[PDB]
Amino acid sequence: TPCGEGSKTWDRFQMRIPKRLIDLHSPSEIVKQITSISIEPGVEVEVTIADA
Amino acid sequence: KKSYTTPKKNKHKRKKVKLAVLKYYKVDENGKISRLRRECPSDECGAGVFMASHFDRHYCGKCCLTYCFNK
Amino acid sequence: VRRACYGVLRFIMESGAKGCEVVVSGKLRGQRAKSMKFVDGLMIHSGDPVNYYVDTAVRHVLLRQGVLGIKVKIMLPWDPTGKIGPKKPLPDHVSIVEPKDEILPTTPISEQK
RNA sequence: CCGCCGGGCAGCUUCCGGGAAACCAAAGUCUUUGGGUUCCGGGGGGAGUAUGGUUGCAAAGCUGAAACUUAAAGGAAUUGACGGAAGGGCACCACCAGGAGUGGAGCCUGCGGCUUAAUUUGACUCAACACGGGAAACCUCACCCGGCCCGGACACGGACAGGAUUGACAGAUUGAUAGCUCUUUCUCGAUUCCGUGGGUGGUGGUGCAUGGCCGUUCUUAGUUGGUGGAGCGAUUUGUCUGGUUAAUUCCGAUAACGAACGAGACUCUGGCAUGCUAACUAGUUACGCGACCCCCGAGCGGUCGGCGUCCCCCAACUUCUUAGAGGGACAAGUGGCGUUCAGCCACCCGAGAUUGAGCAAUAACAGGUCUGUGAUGCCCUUAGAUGUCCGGGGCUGCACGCGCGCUACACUGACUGGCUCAGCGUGUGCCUACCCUACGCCGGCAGGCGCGGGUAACCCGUUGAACCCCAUUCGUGAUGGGGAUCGGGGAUUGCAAUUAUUCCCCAUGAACGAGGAAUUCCCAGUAAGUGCGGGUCAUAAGCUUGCGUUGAUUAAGUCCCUGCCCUUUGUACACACCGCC
Ligand SMILES: [Mg+2]
Ligand SMILES: [Mg+2]
Ligand SMILES: [Mg+2]
């Protein structure tokens, strides 16, 4: 309900967010190949350097 | 609702006075200007800044309108 | 209203729609509010299916009088051929591919290759 | 018994033909108008009245006006819709069988009222009442007692200079260091000011001027068309006697046949998956156990039981964790029952055909919403402004009334030791100034003061909880339950808490010993208790929405009340019985 009234019904607004992650060992080619390809839809990609 | 009676004391919207202001400038014989009365301490109001006699007030008007004292 | 929304409804079907509807709620040449609804073809009105099949769209319209609502609600026939239409089946709908061949009882015989 | 015949009482059936229609061998032969003849109606009432006449013992009978008023009254059939009609069917917003309560007390806050300057205000059965996310000091906020401020767009007019008054540091004041105003004047300097039209807002007005969004009739089974078939035609069948079904869902009888929306299918979810893909942002698992390792403990010692760690890892793995692909469960088998169809019931293997929501048609309703909307019609109002605010105040006020909550009434319990089991979340560093919190001291405590991790599956955080569970008091005393109302301190948030902000520490220490008339809630991991998150948050919840946790009794059917679906029927109702009269 906008405003007050009517028998009290609510909605149950949901958004999921699954995280995958993949470890690897490479140079600055294989990272910059594999990351820039396979992009496109609503997908965020992080790239950690090493360990921390 | 109510309809506003108003205690009969219809408050004044006031004019800031008319005033030509700059006639009182002592030109003693040839061209030279300086009278004396009370002064303000401000920077943009540099030394020339000038004061008064009212029912009390006195004010200084020269950091454009920034800075009137309390006298 | 009349000639216009038909002009729309005509179009959207002719374009290539499974079905469609238009609603023009609001005051309509009278101090009272009417609500008008001109409909055509097929339309599913429940399920998840609705979510990725109908193309709902509300828009107001502010006129020299007051305010109407448009509601266009088109049904997409990408069920036939999206290219791979998402799911394609409305889940109700099953397509049984037909016997095709299944010829010959005959006497036995053999062959070699 | 079987025929025929006349004239009698009657029946069915039909596209004669009639018939407004219902119907009618006759109401048939009627614009294709008249076989004979009798009576008799001309909108409704007034009125079958008044008056007159007559008959009668009289009730009364027969004959029988008008003024006036009146727009329909009426008839036949249609859908409605309601029956204190009838069959069928169904809902725990229904009942049964109960428990839990609720309705009683105190307290909370919701409204009503009174009171009050003000207690702004929307919301009025149900589908108004901890609802407007409505837990409000200040803001909120609109509202009152004031009081400031202008943020008067825009244009159109008016104002070159003896500078249009842009903008003014000590006092009179004022609340204010509001030049907002009463002299003084010292600068920006083309702004300014004053008209006119016109805006611009307005948590002003109107939700019967509207959009959207919502609520609901109503998670109830319903709704619709193409072609047929019926009706001159509105309409009607298809859309249904019965069995079935959560469900016009199905099969079948079947002037219908095959279709469409709703239901169903779907999505999310919730549970079987030593089956797969894996995972230092899970777990890890158990190792291998290589250890530290202290007798942590067993044991003379070998050896072992075990938390912790020393880990790391170039173990190994997914046994639980996680989340991807999968599978499965599908009335699937067998035995009843069943028109032996549609299915129903029981049992087998096993999750037995139903784990729980969201989505939800046609069509509605002055439901609610203009105060969620820079959605807004028109209206008001428009500078002294209902434009925006500062300060305060109110929204909290109190002889009464109702509404949702909590806590109790105690000993299956009360307070006194202790042991010890999560889940969904949540978190900083965020659109304008602001968290989550681990571990040190200090203090009783609120807390305080130290310091640490944390875009988080890492840090909080083996989320170390309450009931619960276990260890002692107490003895049925309004008692140690209960725990209101006040006395006094101390912290914290906040610029500020007076109008106890919130918290702590003291201190007082109430009614209630099971609730009068009523009435909602629901069947399985269900009611109840029980904390805990989230939402609300500077401060903060007795609010909701989720989450486990502990976990019952009982129905497993019926329509007995209330209310819903179809069918048949009646209906002077169609503002639909809360009607009409
Ligand atoms: Mg006749
Ligand atoms: Mg005739
Ligand atoms: Mg007449």
Short mmCIF file of N, CA, C and O (backbone and C1' of nucleotides) in Angstrom, two decimals, chain D residues 263-318:
data_model
loop_
_atom_site.label_atom_id
_atom_site.label_comp_id
_atom_site.label_asym_id
_atom_site.label_seq_id
_atom_site.Cartn_x
_atom_site.Cartn_y
_atom_site.Cartn_z
P A D 263 -4.58 -18.48 -12.23
"O5'" A D 263 -5.16 -19.91 -11.83
"C5'" A D 263 -5.54 -20.18 -10.47
"C4'" A D 263 -6.37 -21.44 -10.35
"C3'" A D 263 -5.60 -22.75 -10.52
"O3'" A D 263 -4.74 -22.96 -9.38
"C1'" A D 263 -7.54 -22.84 -11.86
P G D 264 -3.10 -22.82 -9.49
"O5'" G D 264 -2.67 -24.25 -10.05
"C5'" G D 264 -3.38 -25.45 -9.68
"C4'" G D 264 -3.44 -26.40 -10.85
"C3'" G D 264 -2.14 -26.62 -11.61
"O3'" G D 264 -1.21 -27.50 -10.99
"C1'" G D 264 -3.84 -26.17 -13.17
P A D 265 0.29 -26.99 -10.63
"O5'" A D 265 1.06 -27.05 -12.02
"C5'" A D 265 1.26 -28.29 -12.74
"C4'" A D 265 1.75 -28.00 -14.14
"C3'" A D 265 3.00 -27.13 -14.27
"O3'" A D 265 4.23 -27.84 -14.17
"C1'" A D 265 1.30 -26.23 -15.63
P C D 266 5.51 -27.14 -13.50
"O5'" C D 266 5.44 -25.68 -14.10
"C5'" C D 266 6.38 -25.23 -15.07
"C4'" C D 266 6.47 -23.73 -14.96
"C3'" C D 266 7.36 -23.23 -13.85
"O3'" C D 266 8.69 -23.23 -14.35
"C1'" C D 266 5.31 -22.08 -13.76
P U D 267 9.90 -23.69 -13.42
"O5'" U D 267 10.11 -22.43 -12.47
"C5'" U D 267 10.41 -21.12 -13.01
"C4'" U D 267 10.26 -20.04 -11.95
"C3'" U D 267 10.91 -20.29 -10.60
"O3'" U D 267 12.33 -20.15 -10.59
"C1'" U D 267 8.73 -19.53 -10.25
P C D 268 13.29 -21.26 -9.87
"O5'" C D 268 13.41 -20.72 -8.38
"C5'" C D 268 13.71 -19.34 -8.11
"C4'" C D 268 12.93 -18.84 -6.91
"C3'" C D 268 13.05 -19.65 -5.63
"O3'" C D 268 14.38 -19.68 -5.09
"C1'" C D 268 10.79 -19.09 -5.93
P U D 269 15.09 -21.11 -4.71
"O5'" U D 269 14.36 -21.53 -3.37
"C5'" U D 269 14.13 -20.53 -2.38
"C4'" U D 269 12.95 -20.90 -1.54
"C3'" U D 269 13.04 -22.22 -0.80
"O3'" U D 269 14.06 -22.18 0.19
"C1'" U D 269 10.92 -22.09 -1.78
P G D 270 15.22 -23.31 0.21
"O5'" G D 270 14.55 -24.47 1.07
"C5'" G D 270 13.94 -24.15 2.33
"C4'" G D 270 12.84 -25.13 2.69
"C3'" G D 270 13.17 -26.61 2.63
"O3'" G D 270 14.05 -27.04 3.67
"C1'" G D 270 11.10 -26.28 1.56
P G D 271 15.62 -27.31 3.36
"O5'" G D 271 15.60 -28.50 2.31
"C5'" G D 271 16.01 -29.83 2.68
"C4'" G D 271 14.93 -30.50 3.50
"C3'" G D 271 14.78 -32.00 3.26
"O3'" G D 271 15.82 -32.67 4.00
"C1'" G D 271 12.76 -30.93 2.68
P C D 272 15.81 -34.27 4.28
"O5'" C D 272 16.85 -34.92 3.23
"C5'" C D 272 16.44 -35.37 1.91
"C4'" C D 272 16.53 -36.89 1.69
"C3'" C D 272 17.79 -37.39 0.98
"O3'" C D 272 18.86 -37.39 1.94
"C1'" C D 272 15.93 -38.03 -0.32
P A D 273 20.10 -38.44 1.88
"O5'" A D 273 21.39 -37.52 1.62
"C5'" A D 273 21.77 -36.95 0.34
"C4'" A D 273 21.52 -37.90 -0.81
"C3'" A D 273 22.50 -37.87 -1.99
"O3'" A D 273 23.76 -38.57 -1.89
"C1'" A D 273 20.34 -37.50 -2.81
P U D 274 23.89 -40.14 -1.46
"O5'" U D 274 25.46 -40.40 -1.55
"C5'" U D 274 26.21 -40.65 -0.34
"C4'" U D 274 27.67 -40.95 -0.61
"C3'" U D 274 28.04 -42.43 -0.70
"O3'" U D 274 29.29 -42.50 -1.39
"C1'" U D 274 28.88 -41.56 1.31
P G D 275 29.35 -42.64 -2.99
"O5'" G D 275 27.94 -42.08 -3.51
"C5'" G D 275 27.77 -40.81 -4.23
"C4'" G D 275 27.41 -41.04 -5.70
"C3'" G D 275 27.87 -39.97 -6.69
"O3'" G D 275 29.09 -40.39 -7.31
"C1'" G D 275 25.50 -40.31 -6.91
P C D 276 30.52 -39.75 -6.91
"O5'" C D 276 30.74 -38.61 -8.01
"C5'" C D 276 30.42 -38.85 -9.40
"C4'" C D 276 30.23 -37.56 -10.17
"C3'" C D 276 31.29 -36.47 -10.00
"O3'" C D 276 32.37 -36.59 -10.93
"C1'" C D 276 29.07 -35.56 -9.93
P U D 277 33.66 -35.58 -10.85
"O5'" U D 277 33.03 -34.13 -10.98
"C5'" U D 277 33.26 -33.28 -12.13
"C4'" U D 277 33.03 -31.84 -11.74
"C3'" U D 277 34.10 -31.26 -10.84
"O3'" U D 277 35.23 -30.80 -11.58
"C1'" U D 277 31.92 -30.57 -10.13
P A D 278 36.71 -30.97 -10.99
"O5'" A D 278 36.46 -31.27 -9.44
"C5'" A D 278 37.17 -30.59 -8.37
"C4'" A D 278 36.57 -29.23 -8.11
"C3'" A D 278 36.79 -28.64 -6.73
"O3'" A D 278 38.16 -28.46 -6.31
"C1'" A D 278 34.55 -28.30 -7.31
P A D 279 39.20 -27.48 -7.05
"O5'" A D 279 39.13 -26.14 -6.19
"C5'" A D 279 39.21 -26.15 -4.75
"C4'" A D 279 38.36 -25.04 -4.17
"C3'" A D 279 38.32 -24.96 -2.64
"O3'" A D 279 39.38 -24.12 -2.18
"C1'" A D 279 36.10 -24.98 -3.48
P C D 280 40.66 -24.71 -1.39
"O5'" C D 280 41.10 -23.51 -0.43
"C5'" C D 280 40.31 -22.29 -0.33
"C4'" C D 280 40.76 -21.38 0.81
"C3'" C D 280 41.57 -20.13 0.44
"O3'" C D 280 41.07 -19.07 1.26
"C1'" C D 280 42.76 -21.39 2.03
P U D 281 41.46 -17.55 0.95
"O5'" U D 281 40.04 -16.86 0.69
"C5'" U D 281 39.48 -15.89 1.61
"C4'" U D 281 38.35 -16.49 2.42
"C3'" U D 281 37.79 -17.81 1.95
"O3'" U D 281 37.16 -18.22 3.15
"C1'" U D 281 36.41 -15.96 1.21
P A D 282 37.90 -19.14 4.22
"O5'" A D 282 36.77 -20.22 4.50
"C5'" A D 282 35.45 -20.00 3.95
"C4'" A D 282 34.47 -20.98 4.54
"C3'" A D 282 35.12 -22.09 5.35
"O3'" A D 282 35.45 -21.53 6.61
"C1'" A D 282 33.71 -23.09 3.76
P G D 283 36.72 -22.07 7.40
"O5'" G D 283 36.23 -23.52 7.85
"C5'" G D 283 34.86 -23.74 8.24
"C4'" G D 283 34.43 -25.13 7.84
"C3'" G D 283 35.40 -26.23 8.21
"O3'" G D 283 35.38 -26.45 9.62
"C1'" G D 283 34.69 -26.59 5.99
P U D 284 36.55 -25.86 10.60
"O5'" U D 284 37.92 -26.39 9.96
"C5'" U D 284 38.24 -27.79 9.93
"C4'" U D 284 37.43 -28.44 8.83
"C3'" U D 284 37.64 -29.91 8.59
"O3'" U D 284 36.59 -30.44 9.36
"C1'" U D 284 37.61 -28.71 6.51
P U D 285 36.84 -31.07 10.79
"O5'" U D 285 36.10 -32.47 10.62
"C5'" U D 285 35.39 -32.80 9.39
"C4'" U D 285 36.06 -33.94 8.65
"C3'" U D 285 37.07 -34.74 9.43
"O3'" U D 285 36.49 -35.60 10.44
"C1'" U D 285 37.91 -34.37 7.24
P A D 286 37.08 -35.67 11.98
"O5'" A D 286 38.27 -36.73 11.89
"C5'" A D 286 38.04 -38.15 11.67
"C4'" A D 286 38.89 -38.69 10.55
"C3'" A D 286 40.39 -38.74 10.83
"O3'" A D 286 40.80 -39.99 11.38
"C1'" A D 286 40.01 -37.49 8.88
P C D 287 41.52 -40.07 12.82
"O5'" C D 287 43.03 -40.43 12.46
"C5'" C D 287 43.93 -39.47 11.88
"C4'" C D 287 43.87 -39.51 10.37
"C3'" C D 287 45.09 -40.07 9.67
"O3'" C D 287 44.93 -41.48 9.57
"C1'" C D 287 44.27 -38.10 8.55
P G D 288 46.21 -42.42 9.45
"O5'" G D 288 47.34 -41.43 8.93
"C5'" G D 288 47.82 -41.41 7.57
"C4'" G D 288 49.16 -40.71 7.50
"C3'" G D 288 49.92 -40.63 8.82
"O3'" G D 288 50.52 -41.88 9.18
"C1'" G D 288 49.99 -38.52 7.77
P C D 289 50.37 -42.50 10.67
"O5'" C D 289 48.96 -41.96 11.18
"C5'" C D 289 48.80 -41.10 12.33
"C4'" C D 289 49.44 -39.77 12.06
"C3'" C D 289 50.47 -39.26 13.04
"O3'" C D 289 51.70 -39.95 12.82
"C1'" C D 289 49.17 -37.47 12.10
P G D 290 52.98 -39.69 13.75
"O5'" G D 290 53.68 -38.43 13.05
"C5'" G D 290 54.52 -38.56 11.88
"C4'" G D 290 55.49 -37.40 11.74
"C3'" G D 290 55.79 -36.55 12.97
"O3'" G D 290 56.80 -37.11 13.81
"C1'" G D 290 55.17 -35.12 11.21
P A D 291 56.51 -37.35 15.39
"O5'" A D 291 55.83 -35.97 15.83
"C5'" A D 291 56.44 -35.11 16.80
"C4'" A D 291 56.28 -33.67 16.39
"C3'" A D 291 56.18 -32.70 17.56
"O3'" A D 291 57.51 -32.37 17.93
"C1'" A D 291 54.45 -32.25 15.98
P C D 292 57.91 -32.34 19.46
"O5'" C D 292 56.98 -31.18 20.03
"C5'" C D 292 57.08 -29.84 19.50
"C4'" C D 292 56.29 -28.86 20.34
"C3'" C D 292 56.10 -29.21 21.81
"O3'" C D 292 57.30 -29.11 22.58
"C1'" C D 292 54.08 -28.38 20.96
P C D 293 57.68 -30.26 23.64
"O5'" C D 293 56.49 -30.20 24.69
"C5'" C D 293 55.90 -28.95 25.11
"C4'" C D 293 54.42 -29.12 25.32
"C3'" C D 293 54.03 -30.28 26.20
"O3'" C D 293 54.50 -29.97 27.50
"C1'" C D 293 52.56 -30.22 24.37
P C D 294 55.74 -30.78 28.14
"O5'" C D 294 55.45 -30.64 29.70
"C5'" C D 294 55.00 -29.39 30.23
"C4'" C D 294 53.51 -29.38 30.44
"C3'" C D 294 52.94 -30.52 31.26
"O3'" C D 294 53.32 -30.60 32.63
"C1'" C D 294 51.51 -30.13 29.47
P C D 295 53.83 -32.00 33.24
"O5'" C D 295 53.24 -33.08 32.22
"C5'" C D 295 52.44 -34.21 32.63
"C4'" C D 295 51.00 -33.78 32.87
"C3'" C D 295 50.51 -33.79 34.30
"O3'" C D 295 49.31 -33.03 34.27
"C1'" C D 295 49.56 -35.61 33.18
P C D 296 49.27 -31.54 33.62
"O5'" C D 296 48.73 -31.72 32.13
"C5'" C D 296 47.99 -30.64 31.49
"C4'" C D 296 46.50 -30.92 31.39
"C3'" C D 296 46.04 -32.35 31.63
"O3'" C D 296 46.47 -32.94 32.87
"C1'" C D 296 44.93 -31.59 29.71
P G D 297 45.84 -32.60 34.29
"O5'" G D 297 44.75 -33.74 34.44
"C5'" G D 297 45.18 -35.11 34.35
"C4'" G D 297 44.16 -35.89 33.56
"C3'" G D 297 44.45 -37.37 33.45
"O3'" G D 297 44.36 -38.01 34.73
"C1'" G D 297 43.83 -36.58 31.32
P A D 298 45.46 -39.11 35.17
"O5'" A D 298 45.08 -40.35 34.25
"C5'" A D 298 43.70 -40.77 34.20
"C4'" A D 298 43.46 -41.92 33.25
"C3'" A D 298 44.33 -43.17 33.39
"O3'" A D 298 44.19 -43.89 34.62
"C1'" A D 298 44.13 -42.67 31.11
P G D 299 45.25 -43.68 35.84
"O5'" G D 299 46.48 -44.62 35.47
"C5'" G D 299 46.32 -46.03 35.36
"C4'" G D 299 46.99 -46.53 34.11
"C3'" G D 299 48.49 -46.72 34.15
"O3'" G D 299 49.03 -47.73 35.02
"C1'" G D 299 47.98 -45.57 32.18
P C D 300 49.81 -47.32 36.40
"O5'" C D 300 51.28 -46.92 35.91
"C5'" C D 300 52.13 -46.04 36.70
"C4'" C D 300 53.59 -46.46 36.63
"C3'" C D 300 54.32 -46.11 35.33
"O3'" C D 300 55.25 -45.05 35.54
"C1'" C D 300 54.63 -48.44 35.95
P G D 301 55.36 -43.85 34.48
"O5'" G D 301 55.46 -44.60 33.08
"C5'" G D 301 56.62 -44.47 32.21
"C4'" G D 301 56.82 -45.71 31.37
"C3'" G D 301 56.25 -45.66 29.95
"O3'" G D 301 56.99 -44.92 28.98
"C1'" G D 301 55.76 -47.77 30.96
P G D 302 56.21 -44.22 27.75
"O5'" G D 302 55.70 -45.46 26.88
"C5'" G D 302 56.46 -45.96 25.76
"C4'" G D 302 56.11 -47.40 25.46
"C3'" G D 302 55.08 -47.62 24.36
"O3'" G D 302 55.58 -47.47 23.03
"C1'" G D 302 54.59 -49.04 26.20
P U D 303 54.58 -47.12 21.80
"O5'" U D 303 53.14 -47.41 22.42
"C5'" U D 303 51.99 -47.60 21.59
"C4'" U D 303 50.77 -47.87 22.43
"C3'" U D 303 49.64 -46.86 22.29
"O3'" U D 303 48.97 -47.01 21.04
"C1'" U D 303 49.96 -47.32 24.58
P C D 304 48.35 -45.73 20.28
"O5'" C D 304 47.07 -45.37 21.16
"C5'" C D 304 46.10 -46.38 21.48
"C4'" C D 304 45.28 -45.95 22.67
"C3'" C D 304 44.46 -44.69 22.45
"O3'" C D 304 43.28 -44.93 21.70
"C1'" C D 304 45.50 -44.60 24.57
P G D 305 42.50 -43.70 21.05
"O5'" G D 305 41.92 -42.93 22.32
"C5'" G D 305 40.75 -43.38 23.02
"C4'" G D 305 40.13 -42.22 23.78
"C3'" G D 305 40.26 -40.85 23.13
"O3'" G D 305 39.39 -40.64 22.02
"C1'" G D 305 40.91 -40.66 25.36
P G D 306 39.80 -39.56 20.91
"O5'" G D 306 39.84 -38.21 21.75
"C5'" G D 306 38.67 -37.77 22.44
"C4'" G D 306 39.01 -36.64 23.35
"C3'" G D 306 39.60 -35.42 22.67
"O3'" G D 306 38.61 -35.01 21.73
"C1'" G D 306 40.80 -35.84 24.62
P C D 307 37.99 -33.57 21.74
"O5'" C D 307 39.17 -32.70 21.14
"C5'" C D 307 38.93 -31.36 20.72
"C4'" C D 307 38.85 -30.43 21.91
"C3'" C D 307 39.77 -29.22 21.82
"O3'" C D 307 39.18 -28.24 20.94
"C1'" C D 307 40.22 -30.34 23.84
P G D 308 39.89 -27.83 19.52
"O5'" G D 308 41.07 -26.87 19.99
"C5'" G D 308 40.81 -25.81 20.94
"C4'" G D 308 42.03 -25.49 21.78
"C3'" G D 308 43.31 -25.09 21.05
"O3'" G D 308 43.39 -23.72 20.64
"C1'" G D 308 43.84 -26.69 22.72
P U D 309 42.76 -23.19 19.23
"O5'" U D 309 43.80 -23.68 18.12
"C5'" U D 309 45.06 -23.01 17.88
"C4'" U D 309 46.07 -23.51 18.87
"C3'" U D 309 47.53 -23.44 18.47
"O3'" U D 309 48.06 -22.14 18.81
"C1'" U D 309 47.02 -25.57 19.41
P C D 310 49.67 -21.83 18.81
"O5'" C D 310 50.32 -23.28 18.64
"C5'" C D 310 51.75 -23.48 18.50
"C4'" C D 310 52.10 -23.84 17.08
"C3'" C D 310 51.03 -23.69 16.01
"O3'" C D 310 50.39 -22.48 15.57
"C1'" C D 310 52.35 -25.60 15.54
P C D 311 48.84 -22.54 15.05
"O5'" C D 311 48.87 -21.84 13.62
"C5'" C D 311 48.99 -22.62 12.42
"C4'" C D 311 50.40 -23.14 12.32
"C3'" C D 311 50.95 -23.31 10.92
"O3'" C D 311 51.67 -22.13 10.54
"C1'" C D 311 51.27 -25.32 12.20
P C D 312 50.88 -20.83 10.03
"O5'" C D 312 49.64 -21.45 9.25
"C5'" C D 312 49.69 -21.99 7.90
"C4'" C D 312 50.99 -22.71 7.59
"C3'" C D 312 51.05 -23.39 6.24
"O3'" C D 312 51.15 -22.39 5.22
"C1'" C D 312 51.98 -24.85 7.88
P C D 313 50.18 -22.42 3.91
"O5'" C D 313 50.72 -23.69 3.11
"C5'" C D 313 52.13 -23.92 2.95
"C4'" C D 313 52.41 -25.40 2.80
"C3'" C D 313 51.66 -26.09 1.68
"O3'" C D 313 52.36 -25.87 0.45
"C1'" C D 313 51.73 -27.46 3.65
P C D 314 51.93 -24.72 -0.59
"O5'" C D 314 52.09 -25.46 -1.99
"C5'" C D 314 51.36 -26.68 -2.26
"C4'" C D 314 52.27 -27.86 -2.56
"C3'" C D 314 51.99 -29.16 -1.81
"O3'" C D 314 50.82 -29.91 -2.14
"C1'" C D 314 54.34 -28.85 -2.11
P A D 315 49.74 -30.35 -0.99
"O5'" A D 315 50.35 -31.69 -0.36
"C5'" A D 315 50.17 -32.03 1.05
"C4'" A D 315 49.90 -33.51 1.27
"C3'" A D 315 48.81 -34.15 0.41
"O3'" A D 315 49.45 -35.05 -0.49
"C1'" A D 315 48.27 -34.35 2.76
P A D 316 48.66 -35.66 -1.75
"O5'" A D 316 47.16 -35.79 -1.23
"C5'" A D 316 46.57 -37.07 -0.92
"C4'" A D 316 45.22 -36.90 -0.24
"C3'" A D 316 44.08 -36.53 -1.17
"O3'" A D 316 43.67 -37.70 -1.86
"C1'" A D 316 43.90 -35.37 0.92
P C D 317 42.67 -37.58 -3.10
"O5'" C D 317 41.40 -36.87 -2.45
"C5'" C D 317 40.60 -37.61 -1.51
"C4'" C D 317 39.71 -36.73 -0.66
"C3'" C D 317 38.56 -36.06 -1.36
"O3'" C D 317 37.70 -37.07 -1.89
"C1'" C D 317 39.29 -34.79 0.53
P U D 318 36.86 -36.80 -3.22
"O5'" U D 318 35.69 -35.87 -2.66
"C5'" U D 318 34.63 -36.43 -1.86
"C4'" U D 318 34.32 -35.61 -0.62
"C3'" U D 318 32.95 -34.94 -0.61
"O3'" U D 318 32.13 -35.55 0.39
"C1'" U D 318 34.67 -33.45 0.21
#
